[PDB]
Each structure stands twice: as C-alpha cells, then as structure tokens.
C-alpha cells in the first residue's frame, strides 16, 4: 500500500522480483517432501509455465551478478569441486541459450566465453593465477561443452523445459541459505504470561542476535557468533502484529510474545510485509494481519465479498451445499482477465461477465454504468432477469469461510500437522472408578444439574475437584451429556478448565472438573464496582477473545459464552499483576430447550438459532461475544432488563438494534 509520488523532480530505479519462495518445490530431491497446491476431489504443480521463465531469468541474474553469496569451502578438494560445479552450471546455461536460439554450438561460437557466466569474485580469483591453468580450464570447458551438446541431448532427450528445473535445483544447494531473508538487531525480548509466572525472559546484555524467516520453517533466531537455531513459531500459529514506532511485536495464540527493534520504520514495514504475505499463502487467503500494510485489493474483496481466482469446480460445489435454491450466486475474479468477475448463479448454473474499467462498473451488454460494484449489484437486484426460457430473481449471496480449503492455499509438510482431525461420530472419554471419588457438600443448582464439592484420590493425592451430576428426572438427554464430555476431552488451552473424566456409579453419571477458587466473574464485578480500571477490562477481553479463536480453529461450538461462565484464577486488583480467567464447560445444549427458554436468553442467543435450532454453527459465538463486551463495560448490569417476552421477540422480529 505504499504511495509513490512523482513531481517532475524525482528519479528512481526499481526491480520487479519474485519474493516469496518455497524450497524444494521441484521433486528432484527425494530426501525431503515436495510441495503442491490442493486440488478438487495428480497434485497440481505450484508454478505456472509462464512464471518459470521469469524465475529462471531472475536466478541466472542473481548467480551471475553475485547478489547471492556463494558457499565457502571446507577443504581444498571441495574448494576445487565448487568451482567445477560452477563451470558445469555455466555449461548448462550456455547450452540452454544455444538450444533456445535454435542453432548448434559450431553455428555461433563468436560470443562464447565462460567469463560472463560465473560470479565476479571467482572470475577475479582465477585471473590472478597462472596462464597454463587458464588454458587447461578452457580446454576442460570446451570438452565438457562438446560432450554435453552432442551425447547427452540424444542420450536423455532433454528438452528446453528440462534444463531449467535442473539449473534451479543445483542452484538451490550450491548457494548459501538460498531463498531466505535474515535481519540483524541489537535488542530482542521474549515474554510469556503463564499463571503467576509472567516470565520476562532474556537479558539486557550487549550481545547481538539475528532473525531469519523462511517458507518451510517459519521464524527462528539465535545469537550472532563471535550454534543451531531455536524455533519460535510457524505461520498458522500467529494471531496479530502491532507496530509501535520502530518496534515490532508478534503475538501468538498461547499468549507468548516477541518484541524487537529495527533500524527504522521502513525496515519495520519491510519485515512485516513478508510475514503477512506468507500467512496468506499458508494459512488463509481472505485475511490480513497488520492494518498498516494491507493491500488494497484484499480490502476491497473483504468489503464486497468477492473470492480470489478460485477454480470453477469449487464455486459449483459451494452452491450445492446451500440447497441450490434459485437466486443464490457467487462472485469470483476471472482466472484469465484482470477486469472481469464471474457471477455464477443457480438445476442450472449460469455464468455472467461484469466488466470493470477505470473504477467504473457495468454489466456486459449494456451502456449504463455505476461508480461502485455494490451500487451495480443493488440496481441489478430488483429487476427480473431473462435468459433463454427461464427467468429468476437473485435473493442472497454466498461468502467465504475462515480457513476455507482451495487451490489458493499451498500444502507443506510443516503445515500438514495443523490440519483438523475427524471425529464425526466417535464418542470417547476416560473412566474414573467409583472408589476414587469422595462426595462433599451441596454447592448449588445449575440448568438441570446439581453441583457438589469433592476430592479425588490417587491420580500427588487428595486433590480437590468439582462434581456435576445430571438431574435424575432428565436422563433422556444423556446423549448430550456424553457429547459435551467428549468435546471437552479434545481441548487443551490455558484459559479453559480441565476435565478429569467421567465416573459411573449405579445409574448416576458424574463429570469431574478442576476447581477454581476465585468464583464467577459476575459476582466479583458486582462487588468491586468502583475499583475497576480500564486496562483491567481490556486485559479481561483479550484472553476471552484468544480462547474463542482457539475454539474456532478446531471447528468446535460453545453455546454459553457469557459472564456466568467466566472464573477468576487471580484478582490482580491489588498490584501490577493482571487478572487471570478461565472458561467453563459448554453445559446443556440449546437444542433440547423449549420455545419459552430460548426467549429468555435474549440477547445472548443468536436470532437464526431462534428461527430454527438446527442452524447452530460456529458463527453463533460472535454474537454472544459482542453481547458480553457490552455486559463488561457496565459493571455486570443486566442487558435488556424489564422487557417482557413478547417485547423481546418483537426486538428480534423487527431487526432493531438491541443495545448501543
């Protein structure tokens, strides 16, 4: 998004280069796993045919101009071997040029000389040596060229495309740390906020560090030698990035933090852009991390809802999932033209072309135009369309989804481990023997659930736990109980309570959970109303957001995100230490609730769930989080109180804004 200004006085020269790179994209090296794009249900090659030519030219220029560093030797033998391999690379390049020129070596030997095909430093080194060595290496180069240009070409039937991949593969290993960028800084801070820890790692020494980013490994750092790298994180694990003047901060999902300083703001932006670009290629193509480096096209797509250059099969498949009702449509940029958008509408699947020119939008085959794509869509909404014998009216658009798999994303070995697991119908939990628990006193009643204090033996020993027992009169919903218990088994986060297992005792079923002594956040907010401060509230909100993001990544659904389900592990009111909270268990699902009980959860329950309970999905959480944010800022005041049930229903029905 950098703005370039020309005022008749400025003069500058730039380069158009391929920046993002994945090592071992070619499959020649079998020692490591290859990389490939996803395909609709062999693997699609990563690069287009046209791009490979420009990449080849870029690599050749990098090698010849000595921009990339050549590896240093470890002895005399490999010190000569590297020069031999460079001469072989020059042979390969000149052979490629001769073949593409469509003429043999004897046809145009006028411009042949190996000097123009080696790094300048190596040329300078040879020039200082004896003439006899020069003559001998000339003879060796000529003999190698004569052999390759006549024997190998018929022996292997190598074509023009065949040599480029070999050139790039050889350059990948002949070069020092190829395809990576490394930054240097004098300060580096790593922080973690484990419970009661707040460990401020690192020291205030004057030693220097280096940070390196690469496609297949992520972010790594170490102290500069006067040592092996240590891993920090991979791209899907990051959440957001913030720039403070010239200090860059990186925040992970487990609340770990990294903070470092660079030379200036320009360096900070350059550093941030690389990570932001890699995130889109590896994690999600419909999102940007930092507001300061957002490309305009992604912002436009997010505002309007257009997909990227996605394949037609994916667009067709998406419409099938929504029932394929008449009037639904999908927008996506054309796979070949920089100014056309393919409105795919649905059985029939008709296509339409919208032409975009100098910021003016107009449907193909008409002369009227509009200044905004949204305006063009709105005008087109109310007319009736005619094509062949069928007429239809558009009703609603389809939108992308978080981490939606498509051919835009790139699969890698490291990212393979982050894929979700399939648990479509498996129910699994841990059994606790009835002899290891001791039941205590009554603590209160939940939603069709009773709670007692208790102790667990021989898991240390004599540990205190909370026991939740299903009501005897409501055993029909035992399937929901088992489903919730199975769901809670898969999560592992520092801001969610821990589930020990389930104990079977006669007809009863018991859930055993961790004990947090601070109590619900609601009562604490009620009592300490006057002492609360703004940073306290922001710290509370951040952790809840992080936990909900973690739940979203694994495609699980929590239906009771409210203040009553927030437990205080540390008040933090007294001193600089911040509060610490944990999120409780989902509890009884809304799917088994009556019509009246759905009303009393206004405005916490989403409207589409009130319309039909089967519509429950991950999107319901973003409404409850918004309601909870309002609940926090007013000291736990009851939202929308004093309203009767009919008024609450009218609130949802009339599409009015509930709270401001």
């Amino acid at each position: 998004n950098r703005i370039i200004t020309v005022d008749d006085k400025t003069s500058l020269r730039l380069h158009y280069r391929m920046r993002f790179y994945f090592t071992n994209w070619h499959g020649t090296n079998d020692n490591e796993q290859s990389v490939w794009r996803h395909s609709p249900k062999e693997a699609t090659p990563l690069l287009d045919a046209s791009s490979l030519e420009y990449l080849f030219a870029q690599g050749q220029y990098d090698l010849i101009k000595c921009l990339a560093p050549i590896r240093d030797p470890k002895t005399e033998q490999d010190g000569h071997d590297i020069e031999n391999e460079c001469l072989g690379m020059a042979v390969l390049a000149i052979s490629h040029y001769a073949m593409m020129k469509k003429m043999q070596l004897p046809e145009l030997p006028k411009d042949i000389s190996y000097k123009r095909y080696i790094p300048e430093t190596l040329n300078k080194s040879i020039r200082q040596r004896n003439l006899l060595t020069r003559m001998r290496i000339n003879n060796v180069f000529k003999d190698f060229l004569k052999e390759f240009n006549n024997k190998t070409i018929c022996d292997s039937s190598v074509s023009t495309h065949d040599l480029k991949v070999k050139y790039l593969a050889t350059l990948e290993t002949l070069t020092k740390h190829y395809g990576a960028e490394i930054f240097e800084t004098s300060m580096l801070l790593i922080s973690s906020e484990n419970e009661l820890s707040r460990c401020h790692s690192n020291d205030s020494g004057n030693v220097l560090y280096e940070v390196m980013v690469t496609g297949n490994l992520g972010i790594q750092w170490r102290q500069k030698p006067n040592e092996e790298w240590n891993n920090f994180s991979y791209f899907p694990e990051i959440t957001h990035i913030v720039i403070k003047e010239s200090v860059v901060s990186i925040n992970k999902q487990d609340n770990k933090n990294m903070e470092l300083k660079l030379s200036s703001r320009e360096e900070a932006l350059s550093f941030v852009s690389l990570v932001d670009g890699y995130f889109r290629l590896t994690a999600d193509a419909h999102h940007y991390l930092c507001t300061d480096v957002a490309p305009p096209l992604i912002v436009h797509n997010i505002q309007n809802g257009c997909h990227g250059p996605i394949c037609t099969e994916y667009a067709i498949n998406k419409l099938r999932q929504e029932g394929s009702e008449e009037g639904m449509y999908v927008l996506r940029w054309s796979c070949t033209d920089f100014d056309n958008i393919l409105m795919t509408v649905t059985k029939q699947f008709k296509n339409f072309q919208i032409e975009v020119q100098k910021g003016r939008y107009s449907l193909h085959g008409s002369m009227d135009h509009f200044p905004s794509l949204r305006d063009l869509m709105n005008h087109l909404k109310k007319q009736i369309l005619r094509t062949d014998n069928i007429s239809f009216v558009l009703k609603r658009c389809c939108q992308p989804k978080p981490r939606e798999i498509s051919n835009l994303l790139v699969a890698t070995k490291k990212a393979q481990e982050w894929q979700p697991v399939y648990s479509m119908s498996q129910l699994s939990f841990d059994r606790i023997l009835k002899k290891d628990i001791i039941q205590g006193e009554h603590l209160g009643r939940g939603t069709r659930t009773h709670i007692y204090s208790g102790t667990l033996l021989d898991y240390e020993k004599k540990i205190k736990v909370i026991l939740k027992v299903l009501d005897p009169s409501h055993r029909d919903i035992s399937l929901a109980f088992f489903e919730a218990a199975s769901m809670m088994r898969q999560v592992s986060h520092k801001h969610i309570v821990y589930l020990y297992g389930v104990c079977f005792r006669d007809v009863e079923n018991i859930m055993v959970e961790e004990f947090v002594e601070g109590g619900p956040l609601d009562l604490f907010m009620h009592r300490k109303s006057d002492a609360l401060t703004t940073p306290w509230k922001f710290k509370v909100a951040k952790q809840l957001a992080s936990a909900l993001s973690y739940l979203e990544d694994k495609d699980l659904v929590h239906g009771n995100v409210c203040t009553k389900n927030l437990l205080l592990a540390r008040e933090g009111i007294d001193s600089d230490i911040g509060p610490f909270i944990k999120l409780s268990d989902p509890g009884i699902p809304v799917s088994v609730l009556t019509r009246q009980e759905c009303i009393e959860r206004i405005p916490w329950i989403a409207p589409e769930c009130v319309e039909d309970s089967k519509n429950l999905s991950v999107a319901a959480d973003k409404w409850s989080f918004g309601t909870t944010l309002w609940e926090i800022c007013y000291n736990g005041e009851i939202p929308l109180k004093d309203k009767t049930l009919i008024e609450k229903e009218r609130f949802y029905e009339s599409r009015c804004r509930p709270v401001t």
Partner: protein
C-alpha cells in the same frame, strides 16, 4: 595438481524429470437480458 584429476560434474546427469502446470482453459458464455416489473 589439478591436471591429474578429471571428473565430470555431478549435476550434469538427469533423472525422473519434472513438469509444471500448463495453463487454464478459457471459457465463458453470456446470455444476459434484463426486464423490469
């Protein structure tokens, strides 16, 4: 010293080949005519 050793470059052989993606095949119809109620 080096005159006593002659060896072909290790990178001048080829095996198992490679391939990029060719291209996407262009295609698009249009039968758009509009009417107003």
């Amino acid at each position: 010293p080096w005159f006593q050793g002659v060896k072909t470059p290790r990178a001048l052989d080829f095996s198992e080949y490679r391939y990029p993606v060719a291209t996407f095949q262009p295609s698009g119809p249009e039968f758009s005519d509009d009417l107003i109620l």
